Amino acid sequence: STSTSQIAVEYPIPVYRFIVSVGDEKIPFNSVSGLDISYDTIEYRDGVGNWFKMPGQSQSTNITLRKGVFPGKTELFDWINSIQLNQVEKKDITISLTNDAGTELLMTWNVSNAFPTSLTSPSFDATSNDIAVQEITLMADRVIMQAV
Amino acid sequence: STSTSQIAVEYPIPVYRFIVSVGDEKIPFNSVSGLDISYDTIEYRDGVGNWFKMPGQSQSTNITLRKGVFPGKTELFDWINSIQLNQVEKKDITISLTNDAGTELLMTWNVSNAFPTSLTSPSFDATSNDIAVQEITLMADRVIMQAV
Amino acid sequence: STSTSQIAVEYPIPVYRFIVSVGDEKIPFNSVSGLDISYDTIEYRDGVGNWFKMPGQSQSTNITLRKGVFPGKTELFDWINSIQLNQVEKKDITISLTNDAGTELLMTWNVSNAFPTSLTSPSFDATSNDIAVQEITLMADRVIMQAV
Amino acid sequence: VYASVDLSRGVWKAPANVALKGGLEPKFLVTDELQGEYNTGRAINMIRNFSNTGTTVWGARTLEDKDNWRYVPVRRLFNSVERDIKRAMSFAMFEPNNQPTWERVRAAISNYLYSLWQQGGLAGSKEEDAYFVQIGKGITMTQEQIDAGQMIVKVGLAAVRPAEFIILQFTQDVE
Amino acid sequence: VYASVDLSRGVWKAPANVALKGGLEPKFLVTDELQGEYNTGRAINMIRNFSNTGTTVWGARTLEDKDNWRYVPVRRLFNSVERDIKRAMSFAMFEPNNQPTWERVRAAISNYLYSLWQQGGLAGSKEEDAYFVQIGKGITMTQEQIDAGQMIVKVGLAAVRPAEFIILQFTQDVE
Amino acid sequence: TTVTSYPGVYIEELNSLALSVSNSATAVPVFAVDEQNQYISEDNAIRINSWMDYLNLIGNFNNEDKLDVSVRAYFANGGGYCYLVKTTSLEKIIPTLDDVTLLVAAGEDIKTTVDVLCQPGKGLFAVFDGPETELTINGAEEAKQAYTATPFAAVYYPWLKADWANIDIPPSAVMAGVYASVDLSRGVWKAPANVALKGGLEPKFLVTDELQGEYNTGRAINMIRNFSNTGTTVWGARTLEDKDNWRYVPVRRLFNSVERDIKRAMSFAMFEPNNQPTWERVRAAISNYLYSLWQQGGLAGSKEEDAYFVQIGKGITMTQEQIDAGQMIVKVGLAAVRPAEFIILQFTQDVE
């Protein structure tokens, strides 16, 4: 006999309900991938036997967002088309696990200074029953995870 | 109760209905692959701690078009056969997602200066129930995506 | 969330976009090398212990410009062919880092009184997939670096 | 001089001991004992000539004597930070007043104060010591205030203070 | 701007802080203290220039000061919902006035308000909190009113209000 | 406070402290408030949902108030919503409020009311303060004489002090938050000791280990003392009862919590027909609850049949006479876990 407010505190969070917000816009995405912290390890070892292991230089964060093609809207493409030589508008991406008809966040990830590389066009295919989907890849720094 | 003009505005576009047009000709293709933007990333990092990430040098676009073998027609082969030393006729390829019996485009991709490398002959096979298909591979620049 | 005008002020400049201008002409080059200041050091040392270090005589500037072979044009060769005994036309070379489709310079180097030595012909090679390239070497004086 | 300091070293750096690029020099040479009178209560910064530096600015103090807002780099940092936070809260204007907005308002401020702390603008060895941001329905705003349309955020900062006096002690015996 | 807001984000989103795409700029620059006078009673929304946004719309209030219809996204949502419900009640016109019609009128409205709630148009965490529809012979219409030819439905909605003021509190000590 | 005329944003500068909210299902304290408190009235409890809720009731945070510094130390340690009842009408309001579990004296004399409302049936646990004076190892058995020997009470000795508080903070108000913080992170069955205090607290009097040995034995006074690696920390789990049944506050608070949850499952059986199909639904509802509590590690037993037992029946618990009176009798037994309190190290000089 678990109460419905006990499940909100004790139970794990399902992945499939999430909100992605790219800058000021919020746009519906099919899937989000990557988005993990990582560290190189530095190892010193000298002759008397002691072995030092340290966290080292952080690694660059690479995120992949996947989204279907909608008939009026290309604002994933217009972001990657605006790249002149090294100047692009970087913007913050927030992923947020929500409840059904999300008025309440459960977890929140924050990405800083994300800019697009490698927008992937759909694979046109005459014998396929799929939607035209696009992956955009983002390079960024500082994934942080926020409670609620 | 979704109206049929609401589906034209809100719903994603299926991949299987598309028009490929190679230069002045338009020819029916079985599948189109590749056709994506990409960028190298330049990373500067100095001693005080700040880490600069930039979009860098663009990558060359490589497209693969697949097409069955028809009895009178070899005009994918005659394009790749006309390569003398570095001189080939480059032409523009446009992919375009359409409706049923296409009188109306929904999305459009444009490829500039595409020229053929690596025409692939069918694999003759006495125990196979397939059509003779050919892949041609194109190297090009500047994929752009146009709305409608 | 870096703005696109902040990147123009704070971020380092990529090397690959540059304009070379030889005299009144401007000609596209594949790479520019050398082009550095240098000084000999004079060291005095006497018996009481004090050691004087000084900047000394400047060194001659030697630049190497690399360029592919184009079918109608030999004006790197006609410059080095015009050397009669010690008389050559010296001209000023300016390198300039630019933006994409350069209407705006970011940095500028200036070379004075450059004249050609050692034009290098391409290495013809039946098993190579390369372009015919040429290096010209320039001896000059007074590299100065100008902001914007 | 304010624009020249903040471009070369930042708003958090005080504008003092910076030479004047124009052909300037003070009308009245100022003794050190006179500057000690005016620096204390309602502080008058002074521009005085040094033989190795030329003419230079020699004060960073405001007209407030309180220990909170004594220096012009601390007052101009807080003026600059809250103007940049003004621009990030401009996009939250006329959005729905619920929790998915508040976690986007907090994330936009937390990015800005972190990258300012990474530049050395805020003083703290640990990143959690330099700043804090607090939005919430239990924390900052009442259910009554949410229905009125208000959204309340709490931001704290830890600025760096400039070293103003340096005291040399010269000892005759070396030990 | 009303047509551009509702296509990109919906009728329930307020039309404020949207930049004007044409080459427009206001004839008179408007101070913030002047806009505080006009926003209160019979509210005049104002278009004023921001240096990062360009020119932009900065108001969502109607001419009614009552708390029910204060904002133009709430008034334009109710105008839009009742027009769509008008079209679903068009098929029920001149049908027999009995119970199998009323359970088709209620089902047609309940589909529409549910799919509007799923878009985020109506504010409610629970679906039963956002709307309610009531038809019936005991509930809404008399046996007398049925013989006259009338059919009475009760619809309620819960719109989202926009966040209009954001209050920053800046603290000098970090704790 | 703040008046908003234009939409805009507002960059008001003010120093106000904000504490994060916590929801605690198991610990709802009631803070005894002295008379000469002008903010709360007699004979009604004021539910304070958060520190911001409390900071709306009073205008300014006051350093001199005993109630102010006790409530801020309560919310800084992780306390949920609490009630504020005045101390002279305190014996009338606590029976009205259903879900109240803790009774906290924030520097108040509640020794009269604790004797009359803390009964074996009612679920009230009552943490209050030690003496404010610096006591002795010498006159130590007289200080234990001042407190009652009830099993529902725990006494925490040193009145904590803080840099924000001008006066010393009563230690029972920080322990209502430590009770809520322990039970949320590890459970009610875990003792609240060796937990660091999250607020800026430190004891007024440093306590020697030999002094704590005097007070821990008979009418036990738990003590909050500073460790150099842990900071300040709680160092006791014992009640005021010396009997081996109810010696520790995790065992007494587990039984208070279990019987409150069994109270809610027997609420649906109220005014149902008194026959056998009700009794096998009463037993099944309790047996589900004690099993899932045993699976969490709350009850000590390797075998599930060793941790608990439930017995209802017409031959077993209730007479045919008692059934016609309307009574229904259930027998529940539990096996709680006891905390390890002493650790004895033996150091040997030769390795073998």
- List chain D residues with CB under 8 Å of C1: 88, 108, 111-112
* Helix residue ranges, H only, chain E: 2-8, 32-38, 72-88, 99-118, 127-130, 143-148
The neighbouring-strand residues paired with B31 are A125, B66
Pairing outcome for strands B105-120 and C51-58:
unpaired
Q: What is the nearest CA distance from C99 to chain A, expressed in angstroms?
A: 6
Residue of chain B whose Cα is closest to the Cα of A118: B38
Residue of chain B whose Cα is closest to the Cα of D116: B50
- Name which of F304, F330, F339 is nearest F190 in CA terms: F339
φ/ψ of residue D4, rounded to 5: -80, -30
Residue with tokens 């576009």: B13
Nearest-10 Cα torsion for C135, C141, C147, D4? 150
E112: which DSSP letter?
H
* DSSP conformation letters of E145-173: HHHHT----EEEE-BPPBP-EEEEEEESS
* Helix residue ranges, H only, F10-65: 51-57
Residue of chain F whose Cα is closest to the Cα of A8: F23
| CA distances from residue D23 to D20, D28, D48, F338 in whole angstroms, order as listed | 8, 16, 14, 84
F120: which DSSP letter?
S
Contact C90, C111 (CB under 8 A): no
- Single-letter amino acid, residue D84: D
Cβ contact A71–B106 (<8 Å): yes
Q: Which residues in chain A (2-61) have CB-CB distances under 8 A to chain F?
A: 9
Contact B15, A122 (CB under 8 A): yes
* DSSP conformation letters of F208-230: -HHHHHHHTTSS-EE-EEEETTT
How many Å apart are CA F119 and CA F125, to the nearest integer? Answer: 10
How many Å apart are CA F295 and CA A133, to the nearest integer? Answer: 46
Cβ contact E168–D149 (<8 Å): no
Q: Which of D68, D92, D132 sits opposite E166 (nearest CB)?
A: D92
Q: Report how this structure was experimentally obtained.
A: cryo-EM
How many Å apart are CA F101 and CA F90, to the nearest integer? Answer: 14
* DSSP conformation letters of D98-154: SHHHHHHHHHHHHHHHHHHHHTT-B--SSHHHHEEEE--TTTT--HHHHHHTEEEEE
Q: Does B12 touch chain A (CB under 8 A)?
A: yes
User: Which residues of E sit within 8 Å Cβ distance of B?
Assistant: 88, 108, 111-112
CA atoms within 13 A on the CB side of F319: 3
- List chain E residues with CB under 8 Å of A104: 125
**Burial class of residue F296 (count of CB atoms within 10 Å of its CB; 0-12, 13-18, 19+):** exposed
Please give the sequence-ordered ranges of beta strands (E in DSSP) within chain F, or none if there are none: 9-10, 30-33, 46-48, 82-86, 102-105, 125-129, 153-156, 160-162, 201-203, 221-222, 224-227, 231-234, 308-311, 331-334
φ/ψ of residue C130, rounded to 5: -115, 165
Structure tokens at B66: 């697949």
Report which secondary-structure segment, H or E, holds F284: helix F276-295
- Single-letter amino acid, residue F230: T
How many Å apart are CA E115 and CA E109, to the nearest integer? Answer: 10
Report which secondary-structure segment, H or E, holds B61: strand B61-68
How many Å apart are CA D112 and CA E169, to the nearest integer? Answer: 16
Q: What is the nearest CA distance from D74 to chain E, expressed in angstroms?
A: 10
Q: Which chains contact F through at least 3 pairs of Cβ atoms less than 8 Å apart?
A: A, D, E
Q: Which of B38, B42, B51 sits opposite A118 (nearest CB)?
A: B38
At B118 the three-state DSSP class reads strand
F325: which DSSP letter?
H
Which of D67, D95, D139, D144 is the mutation pick for testing E, counting most E CBs within 10 A?
Answer: D95
How many Å apart are CA D75 and CA D82, to the nearest integer? Answer: 11
Q: Does B129 touch chain E (CB under 8 A)?
A: no
Structure tokens at E109: 């409205």
10 Å Cβ neighbour count for F341? 13
- Name which of D113, D123, D133 is nearest D158 in CA terms: D123
CA angle F257, F258, F260 (to 5 degrees): 65
How many Å apart are CA D13 and CA D23, to the nearest integer? Answer: 24
Q: Which of A86, A91, A112 sits opposite C7 (nearest CB)?
A: A86
Q: What is the nearest CA distance from B1 to chain E, expressed in angstroms?
A: 8
Contact B91, B23 (CB under 8 A): yes
Nearest-10 Cα torsion for F36, F39, F42, F47? -140
Sign of the Cα torsion F108, F111, F115, F121 reads positive
- Single-letter amino acid, residue E71: Y
Cα D51 to its chain centre, rounded Å, is 30
Report which secondary-structure segment, H or E, holds C118: strand C105-120
Cβ contact B38–A117 (<8 Å): yes
Residue of chain E whose Cα is closest to the Cα of B9: E7
Cβ contact B42–C16 (<8 Å): no
- Name which of F221, F171, F168, F215 is nearest F197 in CA terms: F171
* DSSP conformation letters of D55-101: EEE---B-S--SSSS-BHHHHHHHHHHHHHHHHHTTTTTTSB-SHHH
* Helix residue ranges, H only, chain C: 4-10, 77-81
Nearest-10 Cα torsion for F266, F271, F272, F276? 70
Residue of chain B whose Cα is closest to the Cα of E109: B1
* Helix residue ranges, H only, C24-122: 77-81
- Per this entry, what is the length of chain A? 148
The sheet with strand A31-34 has its strands ordered as A18-22, A91-98, A105-120, A133-147, A61-68, A31-34
- Our answer on whether D and F touch (3+ beta-carbon pairs < 8 Å) is yes
How many Å apart are CA F97 and CA F28, to the nearest integer? Answer: 10
Q: What is the resolution of this structure in A?
A: 2.9
How many Å apart are CA E1 and CA A105, to the nearest integer? Answer: 31
Taking only Cα atoms into account, the Rg of chain C, rounded to an integer number of angstroms, comes to 20
CA angle B63, B68, B72 (to 5 degrees): 120
How many Å apart are CA B95 and CA B106, to the nearest integer? Answer: 11
Q: Does A121 touch chain B (CB under 8 A)?
A: yes
Report which secondary-structure segment, H or E, holds F39: none
**Burial class of residue F120 (count of CB atoms within 10 Å of its CB; 0-12, 13-18, 19+):** exposed
10 Å Cβ neighbour count for B89? 10
How many Å apart are CA F218 and CA F144, to the nearest integer? Answer: 8
10 Å Cβ neighbour count for B3? 9
- List chain C residues with CB under 8 Å of B43: none
- List chain B residues with CB under 8 Å of A86: 42, 54-56
Q: Does B42 touch chain C (CB under 8 A)?
A: yes
Q: What is the nearest CA distance from E8 to chain A, expressed in angstroms?
A: 9
CA atoms within 13 A on the CB side of F253: 30
Which of B21, B64, B138, B145 is the mutation pick for testing A, counting most A CBs within 10 A?
Answer: B145
F244: which DSSP letter?
S
Q: Does C14 touch chain B (CB under 8 A)?
A: yes
- Single-letter amino acid, residue F128: F
Cβ contact A9–F285 (<8 Å): no
How many Å apart are CA F298 and CA F282, to the nearest integer? Answer: 21
- List chain A residues with CB under 8 Å of C11: 86
- Per this entry, what is the length of chain B? 148
* DSSP conformation letters of D18-56: -B-SSS---SS---HHHHHHHTTSS----EEEETTTEEE
Contact D53, D17 (CB under 8 A): yes
CA angle D53, D54, D59 (to 5 degrees): 75
Q: Does A113 touch chain C (CB under 8 A)?
A: yes
Pairing outcome for strands F82-86 and E54-57:
unpaired
Q: Does A88 touch chain C (CB under 8 A)?
A: yes
The neighbouring-strand residues paired with A87 are A84
Q: Does B53 touch chain A (CB under 8 A)?
A: yes
How many Å apart are CA A140 and CA A63, to the nearest integer? Answer: 8
| CA distances from residue C38 to C55, C143, D50, E110 in whole angstroms, order as listed | 10, 10, 35, 83
How many Å apart are CA D118 and CA A141, to the nearest integer? Answer: 13
| CA distances from residue E57 to B47, D101, E21, E24, E60 in whole angstroms, order as listed | 45, 20, 12, 12, 9
Cβ contact A90–C11 (<8 Å): no
Contact A92, D107 (CB under 8 A): yes
Q: Does A117 touch chain B (CB under 8 A)?
A: yes
Q: For chain C, first and last CA: distance in Å?
A: 26
How many Å apart are CA F212 and CA F204, to the nearest integer? Answer: 15
Residue with tokens 């390797």: F302
Q: What is the nearest CA distance from B148 to chain C, expressed in angstroms?
A: 28
At B7 the three-state DSSP class reads helix
How many Å apart are CA F219 and CA F247, to the nearest integer? Answer: 10
Contact F46, F84 (CB under 8 A): yes
- Single-letter amino acid, residue D171: T
- List chain F residues with CB under 8 Å of A1: 265, 285, 288-289
How many Å apart are CA E23 and CA F109, to the nearest integer? Answer: 75
- Name which of A77, A76, A128, A120 is nearest B14 in CA terms: A128
**Burial class of residue F18 (count of CB atoms within 10 Å of its CB; 0-12, 13-18, 19+):** buried
Residue with tokens 């520019």: C32
Query: Helix axis angle, E72-88 relative to E99-118, nearest 10°?
Result: 140
Cβ contact E167–D151 (<8 Å): yes
